Design an enzyme around this catalytic site. Structure first.
Site, short mmCIF file in Angstrom:
data_model
loop_
_atom_site.label_atom_id
_atom_site.label_comp_id
_atom_site.label_asym_id
_atom_site.label_seq_id
_atom_site.Cartn_x
_atom_site.Cartn_y
_atom_site.Cartn_z
N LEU A 11 0.93 -1.31 -0.15
CA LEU A 11 -0.05 -0.07 0.05
C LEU A 11 0.82 1.23 -0.18
CD1 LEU A 11 -2.70 -1.06 2.71
CD2 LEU A 11 -2.69 -1.35 0.08
N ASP A 50 1.29 -8.54 9.68
CA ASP A 50 2.43 -7.78 10.06
C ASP A 50 3.82 -8.59 9.87
OD1 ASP A 50 4.60 -6.84 11.89
OD2 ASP A 50 3.02 -5.76 12.89
N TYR A 139 17.77 4.19 10.09
CA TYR A 139 17.45 3.64 8.77
C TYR A 139 18.46 3.24 7.89
CZ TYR A 139 15.24 3.87 4.15
OH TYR A 139 14.60 3.75 2.69
N1 LIG Z 1 10.36 5.93 -1.63
C1 LIG Z 1 11.75 6.10 -1.53
O1 LIG Z 1 12.01 7.22 -2.12
C2 LIG Z 1 12.45 5.00 -1.26
C3 LIG Z 1 14.04 5.23 -1.30
C4 LIG Z 1 14.75 4.29 -0.82
C5 LIG Z 1 14.47 2.97 -0.66
N2 LIG Z 1 12.96 2.82 -0.39
C6 LIG Z 1 12.55 1.54 0.10
O2 LIG Z 1 11.65 0.82 -0.79
C7 LIG Z 1 10.72 0.20 -0.04
C8 LIG Z 1 9.27 0.82 -0.16
O3 LIG Z 1 9.22 2.01 0.10
P1 LIG Z 1 8.14 3.12 0.11
O4 LIG Z 1 8.57 4.61 0.00
O5 LIG Z 1 7.08 2.44 -0.72
O6 LIG Z 1 7.68 2.98 1.61
P2 LIG Z 1 6.11 3.47 2.30
O7 LIG Z 1 6.31 3.61 3.92
O8 LIG Z 1 5.37 4.18 1.26
O9 LIG Z 1 5.51 2.01 2.30
C9 LIG Z 1 6.02 0.94 3.18
C10 LIG Z 1 4.72 0.13 3.49
O10 LIG Z 1 5.14 -0.70 4.63
C11 LIG Z 1 4.41 -1.07 5.69
N3 LIG Z 1 4.69 -1.35 6.88
C12 LIG Z 1 5.22 -0.73 7.64
N4 LIG Z 1 5.33 -1.39 8.90
C13 LIG Z 1 4.94 -2.62 8.50
C14 LIG Z 1 4.87 -3.93 9.33
N5 LIG Z 1 5.37 -4.01 10.78
N6 LIG Z 1 4.52 -5.01 8.76
C15 LIG Z 1 3.95 -4.78 7.38
N7 LIG Z 1 3.91 -3.80 6.61
C16 LIG Z 1 4.49 -2.65 7.15
C17 LIG Z 1 3.41 0.23 5.50
O11 LIG Z 1 2.31 -0.03 5.93
C18 LIG Z 1 3.63 0.95 4.28
O12 LIG Z 1 2.44 0.93 3.36
C19 LIG Z 1 11.35 0.25 1.48
O13 LIG Z 1 12.31 -0.81 1.65
C20 LIG Z 1 12.08 1.35 1.37
O14 LIG Z 1 13.08 1.52 2.29
C21 LIG Z 1 12.11 3.80 -0.86
#
Ligand SMILES: NC(=O)c1ccc[n+]([C@@H]2O[C@H](COP(=O)([O-])OP(=O)(O)OC[C@H]3O[C@@H](n4cnc5c(N)ncnc54)[C@H](O)[C@@H]3O)[C@@H](O)[C@H]2O)c1
Length: 311
Positions: A11, A50, A139
């Protein structure tokens, strides 16, 4: 095989778009989404979990005959500075659950990293693939540990796990979550919605950025590469753009009238420890990476869609 794919963190910012891309690539019946809470109005099969709950996670994988997991669940940098224990727990123990399960069920994995693995002891400009990783955030530490754990599963356990150190990602389909790089997303949203934005980093803050369509394509291309062509596994550097906040303001202002004020907060202290730009030669060499969206093209997509949504 079943050909079934699970997306954790489905999501979130990436997952919102990656689920669609995987449905179009593989067929809708092949993709299962998972996140903490079941969404109301949602056109993918969904299993709540989770990521820390190993029993339920395993069950979802078993029952759905999951062969490939795109593991997006995480706590990101700004949230992790506010809540270090939660960040470690979700990122590290969630990852461990994913990797242990992959070993049990012979799965292929995508487990992303971040440019947050880097700290100021290595180059800020065109950071190389192979430099020391001494991040200055909780992080970032989780991501370094995660890269290493993934690569251990690859070498010691034969698990084909791949990942990208994503730069800051920009998209319009998901509301901004106020992450460290989210000032770029918010600037677009607020420019179009209200004609004003209060930026939470200073005007010269300059980070590696990428439009979501590029990041999603990169993810799929890396996953489709032949394994023998990869010289890296969990942690490809990946590049597209590098611009400052005021440069983005000027690009947006060429299209939309808006007042941008700069009022830095704690997120500045995170951004200041990251590189400005990234050397992704290994991605370009090993699996043919090339970005397709520059700042102009991204701006057109963002502004067009955001204006539509604000009708
Ligand atoms: N968007 C960016 O700019 C970016 C940059 C570098 C790395 N990333 C990596 O890409 C991945 C996704 O990033 P994103 O931007 O979509 O993050 P986001 O926060 O939009 O999505 C993460 C999802 O993880 C879910 N989540 C959180 N805790 C949880 C739990 N205990 N159990 C199950 N689900 C859980 C949340 O509900 C959320 O929907 C992550 O690994 C992030 O570190 C993203």
């Amino acid at each position: 095989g079943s050909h079934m794919i699970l997306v954790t963190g489905a999501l979130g910012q990436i997952g919102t778009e990656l689920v669609l891309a995987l449905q179009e690539k593989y067929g809708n019946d092949k993709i299962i989404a998972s996140d903490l809470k079941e969404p109301e109005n949602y056109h993918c099969k969904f299993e709540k979990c989770d990521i820390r709950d190993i029993e339920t996670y395993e069950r979802i994988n078993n029952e759905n005959k999951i062969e490939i997991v795109y593991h997006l669940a995480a706590i990101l940098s700004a949230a992790g500075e506010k809540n270090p224990e939660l960040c470690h727990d979700v990122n590290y123990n969630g990852l461990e659950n994913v990797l242990k399960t992959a070993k049990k069920y012979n799965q292929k994995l995508f487990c992303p990293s971040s440019i947050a693995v880097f700290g100021p002891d290595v180059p800020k400009e065109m950071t190389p693939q192979n430099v020391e990783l001494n991040p200055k955030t909780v992080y970032g530490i989780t991501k370094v540990k995660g890269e290493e754990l993934c690569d251990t599963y690859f070498k010691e356990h034969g698990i084909d796990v791949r990942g990208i150190r994503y730069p800051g990602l920009i998209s319009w389909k998901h509301k901004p979550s106020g992450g460290t790089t989210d000032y770029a997303v918010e600037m677009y949203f607020d420019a179009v919605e209200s004609g004003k934005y209060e930026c939470f980093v200073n005007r010269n803050t300059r980070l590696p950025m990428m439009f979501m369509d590029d990041a999603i394509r990169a993810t799929l291309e890396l996953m489709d590469a032949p394994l023998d062509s990869l010289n890296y596994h969990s942690n490809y550097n990946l590049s597209s753009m590098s611009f400052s906040a005021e440069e983005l303001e000027k690009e947006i202002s060429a299209h939309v009238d808006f007042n941008c004020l700069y009022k830095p907060d704690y997120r500045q202290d995170i951004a200041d420890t990251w590189p400005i730009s990234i050397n992704d030669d290994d991605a370009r060499k090993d699996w043919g990476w090339e970005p397709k969206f520059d700042i102009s093209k991204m701006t057109e997509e963002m502004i067009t869609n955001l204006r539509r949504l604000n009708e």
